[PDB]
Symmetry: C2
Subunit: 99 residues, 2 copies
């Protein structure tokens, strides 16, 4: 659907059996979730934004349902205060900016 932006574009995600809300973020290269239990191996990584950098864990081939649409991709887990869906996954659900 069409999401206007008077409010934070928050949507429902399903990941590893858990229901969460995540922000649809065109300013994020990657997808980064608050700490949660994720199976498999994981590589150590750094992400940066305003104010600094943080240490996240990167998981490949994670299944995720973003509001009804399944996508499979890299997911980062770390000390973010909000769940963020980034461009890596917004493209898999054909998400576009319009004006």
């Amino acid at each position: 659907p069409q999401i206007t932006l008077w409010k934070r574009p928050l949507v429902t995600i399903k990941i590893g059996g858990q229901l969460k809300e995540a922000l649809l973020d065109t300013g994020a290269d990657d997808t980064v979730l608050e700490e949660m239990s994720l199976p498999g191996r994981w590589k150590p990584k750094m992400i940066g934004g305003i104010g600094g950098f943080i240490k996240v864990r990167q998981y490949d081939q994670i299944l995720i349902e973003i509001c009804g649409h399944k996508a499979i991709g890299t997911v980062l887990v770390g000390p973010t205060p909000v769940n963020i869906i980034g461009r890596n996954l917004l493209t898999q659900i054909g998400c576009t900016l319009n004006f």
Copy 2:
């Protein structure tokens, strides 16, 4: 127009006689620009993101042309490594997320 998201959604802005490129960011509440010369008074403020918080200067009623479309709004100036157009101004140009 329609902006797909395989690349960073970067666009041309015009602000206070200067040409810059800015990121269209649905994950940002506010608009924050790299340090630049801006007239008028300005209130001190704090913004936060991953990794921390930063001190910005806030200017009200700044004219800005985001890719052809004029908008007038609050603009923050600070130590961001990238120019960011936030939701406060994306709504004035009727920008929407679609999928």
